[PDB]
Design a protein around this ligand. Structure first.
Ligand code: HEM
Length: 432
C-alpha cells in the first residue's frame, strides 16, 4: 500500500532520471522485484501507478474501455504523454480546459481512435510496404556510400544513423529533400522538451511549465508547415502518404478536420524516423559490446530480423504512454481507483525476468522474441512493420561492410521520459 520510495519514483518520473540508462533500469528492476505495482507520488506530478511488469502492460492495454488514453467521453481530460502538473495547467490555459493538443492517435479513445486509425492502417501493413523495399534499399546504399566516404571515425548517430530513416519517411510521406533539416530540427525540439541541450530559444527554459511551452510551440510550427502540405495534396493528389491522409473523408463524405491530418503528420515526421534511428544506433552500440554477434550475423544474414528484434527489446526507445482508469480496478493485489493515472513502462516490461531469461543480456537467439517495444492493444505501434523493414534493409546492406565497431568516446542519451535513445555514439569503425 505504501507509495513507491521517493528516489525510485523520481528516477522514472523525472526526465533527468533517464539521462543515464544504468540507474534508470536499476530503478525499473527494483520495482519489478520489490513493488511491481505501486503509486509514484513525485512533487509536481499527479500520482501515477508505475506499470513495470510485462503481464500488467498487456492487461491494461487490452482493456481500453477501462484504461483510457485521452479520458474517454471527456475528451482531452487525460494527457497520454506525461507532462508535469504545471505543464498540464499551461495546456489547459492554452486550449481552454483540456489537454487534447493534437488529434493524433495517442490522444484518442474508441470509437474515434478506430475510425481515425483506419485511414492509414492498410498502408502500414507488411504486404503493402513491400512496394517500398527497393526505394528503402537504394536509400540505405546511398547512406552507406557516404559512411564509407567519410572514414572510420564519426558520431554513429548525428553523422550516420539519423539520416537514413529521415530520408525514407520524408520520401514516402512526400516532403522534399530540402525540407529534411527543418523536420529534423522540429523533431529535436519535440522529443527534447525536457533535455537541457535541446531548449528552444522562444520559450522560458526555466519556467515550471517549460516543457509544455516547448511542446506547444513545436506543434504550432508543425501545423504551419503541414497546413500548406494538406492544402497542396487536396488540390493535387500525389502517390504519397501525405495524400492518403490529406484527402481522407469520414462516413458522411466530409474531409476529416485538417488537424486530424496534422496529427498523423506530426507522428510520421517525428516517431517515423527518430525511433528507427535510435534502434539502429543502439544496435551498433550492442555490436561493439558483443563483437561475436556481428561475426555471427555477417556469417548468417538470415539472423538480421532476430538482431532487429533484440535491438528493439534492449533499446525500447518509446518509454511510456499514460492511461486513466474509468472505473475502479483490482490488479496484482492493488486497488486502482477511478481517475487514477497509470504510466506504462515499456522498457521495464522488456526486462521482465518472468518473460525473458537473463533479460539484461543481448541474446539474438530468443525465438520467439516476445518483446513489447511496440506496446499492445488497439494503440499498438502502427509504424512497427515499416520500422522492422527499414532496420532489416539497412543491416543487410551495412553489416557486410563492417568488420568491427568500437565505441571511442562517451555515448549520450536524450534526457526524456518519453521518446529517447542515443543522440551521440562516438565510434571507430573497421571497414571490410
Ligand atoms: C523502432 C521503432 C519504433 C518503436 C520502438 C515504436 C514504439 C511505439 C510504442 C511503444 C507505441 C505506443 C503503443 C501503445 O500505446 O501501446 C507507439 C505508438 C505509435 N507509433 Fe511507433 N514506434 C516505432 C516506430 C514508428 C514509426 C516508424 C512510425 C510511423 C511511421 C510510428 C508511429 C506510431 C504512432 C502513430 C503511434 C500511435 C498509435 C496509437 O496511439 O494508436 N512508430 N510506437
Amino acid at each position: 500500500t505504501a507509495a513507491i520510495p521517493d528516489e525510485i519514483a523520481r528516477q522514472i518520473v523525472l526526465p533527468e532520471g533517464h539521462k543515464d540508462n544504468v540507474p534508470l533500469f536499476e530503478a525499473y528492476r527494483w520495482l519489478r522485484e520489490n513493488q511491481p505495482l505501486g503509486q509514484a507520488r513525485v512533487e509536481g506530478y499527479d500520482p501515477l501507478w508505475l506499470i513495470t511488469k510485462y503481464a500488467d502492460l498487456m492487461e491494461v492495454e487490452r482493456q481500453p474501455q477501462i484504461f483510457a488514453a485521452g479520458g474517454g467521453e471527456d475528451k482531452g481530460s487525460n494527457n497520454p504523454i506525461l507532462a508535469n502538473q504545471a505543464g498540464d495547467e499551461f495546456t489547459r490555459q492554452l486550449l481552454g480546459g483540456n489537454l487534447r493538443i493534437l488529434d493524433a492517435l495517442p490522444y484518442l479513445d474508441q470509437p474515434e481512435h478506430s475510425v481515425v486509425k483506419d485511414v492509414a492502417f492498410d498502408w502500414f501493413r507488411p504486404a503493402n510496404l513491400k512496394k517500398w523495399e527497393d526505394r528503402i534499399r537504394e536509400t540505405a546504399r546511398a547512406s552507406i556510400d557516404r559512411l564509407l566516404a567519410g572514414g572510420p571515425d564519426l558520431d554513429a548517430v548525428q553523422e550516420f544513423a539519423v539520416f537514413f530513416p529521415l530520408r525514407v519517411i520524408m520520401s514516402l510521406f512526400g516532403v522534399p529533400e530540402e525540407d529534411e533539416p527543418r523536420m529534423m530540427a522540429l523533431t529535436q525540439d519535440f522529443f527534447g522538451v525536457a533535455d537541457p541541450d535541446a531548449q528552444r530559444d522562444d520559450i522560458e527554459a526555466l519556467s515550471p511549465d517549460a516543457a509544455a511551452q516547448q511542446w506547444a510551440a513545436t506543434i504550432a510550427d508543425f501545423y504551419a508547415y503541414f497546413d500548406v502540405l494538406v492544402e497542396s495534396r487536396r488540390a493535387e493528389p500525389r502517390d504519397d502518404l501525405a495524400t492518403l491522409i490529406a484527402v481522407a473523408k469520414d462516413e458522411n463524405g466530409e474531409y476529416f478536420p485538417k488537424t486530424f491530418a496534422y496529427g498523423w503528420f506530426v507522428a510520421i515526421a517525428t516517431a517515423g524516423h527518430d525511433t528507427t534511428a535510435s534502434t539502429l544506433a543502439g544496435c551498433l552500440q550492442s555490436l561493439a559490446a558483443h563483437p561475436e554477434v556481428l561475426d555471427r550475423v555477417k556469417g548468417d544474414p538470415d539472423l538480421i530480423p532476430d538482431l532487429v528484434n533484440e535491438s528493439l527489446r534492449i533499446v525500447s526507445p518509446v518509454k511510456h504512454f499514460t492511461r486513466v482508469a474509468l472505473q475502479d480496478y483490482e490488479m496484482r493485489g492493488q486497488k486502482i481507483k477511478a481517475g487514477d493515472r497509470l504510466m506504462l513502462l515499456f522498457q521495464s516490461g522488456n526486462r521482465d525476468a518472468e518473460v525473458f531469461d537473463r533479460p539484461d543480456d543481448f541474446d539474438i537467439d530468443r525465438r520467439p522474441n516476445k518483446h513489447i517495444a511496440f506496446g499492445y492493444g488497439p494503440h499498438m505501434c502502427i509504424g512497427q512493420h515499416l520500422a522492422k523493414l527499414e532496420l532489416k534493409v539497412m543491416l543487410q546492406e551495412l553489416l557486410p561492410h563492417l568488420e568491427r565497431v568500437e565505441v571511442s568516446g562517451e555515448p549520450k542519451l536524450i534526457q526524456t521520459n518519453f521518446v529517447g535513445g542515443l543522440r551521440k555514439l562516438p565510434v571507430h569503425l573497421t571497414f571490410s
